Amino acid sequence: GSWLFSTCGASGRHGPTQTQCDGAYAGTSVVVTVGAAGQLRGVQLWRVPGPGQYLISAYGAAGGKGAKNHLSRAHGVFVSAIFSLGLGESLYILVGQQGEDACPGGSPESQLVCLGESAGGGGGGGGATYVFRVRAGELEPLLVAAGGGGRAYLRPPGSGGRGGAAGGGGGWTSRAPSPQAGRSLQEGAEGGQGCSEAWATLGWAAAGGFGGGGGACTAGGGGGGYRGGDASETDNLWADGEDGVSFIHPSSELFLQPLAVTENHGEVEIRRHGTDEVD
Ligand SMILES: [Tb+3]
Numbered sequence: 436g437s438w439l440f441s442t443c444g445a446s447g448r449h450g451p452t453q454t455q456c457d458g459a460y461a462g463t464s465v466v467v468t469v470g471a472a473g474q475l476r477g478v479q480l481w482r483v484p485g486p487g488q489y490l491i492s493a494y495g496a497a498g499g500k501g502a503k504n505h506l507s508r509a510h511g512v513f514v515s516a517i518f519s520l521g522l523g524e525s526l527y528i529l530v531g532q533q534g535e536d537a538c539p540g541g542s543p544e545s546q547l548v549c550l551g552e553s554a555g556g557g558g559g560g561g562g563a564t565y566v567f568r569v570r571a572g573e574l575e576p577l578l579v580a581a582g583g584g585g586r587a588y589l590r591p592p593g594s595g596g597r598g599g600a601a602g603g604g605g606g607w608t609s610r611a612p613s614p615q616a617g618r619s620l621q622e623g624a625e626g627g628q629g630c631s632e633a634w635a636t637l638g639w640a641a642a643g644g645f646g647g648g649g650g651a652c653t654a655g656g657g658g659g660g661y662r663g664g665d666a667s668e669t670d671n672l673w674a675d676g677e678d679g680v681s682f683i684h685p686s687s688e689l690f691l692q693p694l695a696v697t698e699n700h701g702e703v704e705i706r707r708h709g710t711d712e713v714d
């Protein structure tokens with residue numbers, strides 16, 4: 436009795452298609468309906484197979500590396516909690532995608548930065564992983580596992596993160612103030628675009644990951660979350676984006692200490708497990 440959810444092979448600022456998830460889940464226990472457009476595009480709808488308690492373990496996505504800030508990515512957050520789910524219930528699962536790395540570059544000029552032949556150079560914020568339901572016509576969050584902030588170019592309320600040229604992360608209910616800000620869950624949670632100044636300078640810029648990651652500029656993008664991580668408001672050369680803020684519903688039982696462990700894309704595992712168990 437275990438169900439594993441992934442990005443279905445999708446990466447970048449946009450979530451997976453139905454065909455991608457059908458392929459990824461072929462031969463597995465999982466069937467999902469993927470939103471095709473609007474606020475739920477790329478979100479995976481899973482029918483709960485029966486009533487009872489379930490352990491939901493979610494991993495938000497890592498942030499991207501910066502062109503000269505690459506010794507490690509900011510890892511996404513792991514959050515795990517027990518929920519009572521209903522006969523007939525359906526869960527919406529948005530699996531966060533990694534913030535884009537600055538290297539290799541997506542244009543000749545950005546790649547020259549990556550080869551030392553040089554706004555720009557930052558990594559995008561990672562998307563958060565969201566698990567939620569609809570109750571009485573409203574979205575109800577169950578668990579949000581935050582994404583990691585993107586690295587800056589150089590190494591020395593469900594609100595959105597602050598930012599500017601580098602985008603803050605999207606939150607649960609934030610409004611995006613710019614194209615670089617990560618979209619909120621209510622808005623469909625696409626990653627922010629890289630900043631226009633870097634697109635103009637280098638011909639490409641790293642985007643935030645699906646799940647509310649902010650776009651890079653020189654500073655790194657903020658991670659998605661229940662609250663989005665802040666990014667620099669001045670495109671500072673050394674300012675990594677902040678990770679997002681995670682969430683568990685007040686009625687659930689947090690099972691394990693949250694940890695920053697996700698290496699690349701997010702994931703969710705669900706299994707039958709409850710407070711009837713001692714461990
Ligand atoms: Tb902050």
Ligand SMILES: [Tb+3]
Nearest residue numbers: 439494702704
């Ligand atoms: Tb694994």
Ligand SMILES: [Tb+3]
Nearest residue numbers: 708709711712
């Ligand atoms: Tb049992």
Ligand SMILES: [Tb+3]
Nearest residue numbers: 708709711712
């Ligand atoms: Tb038993």
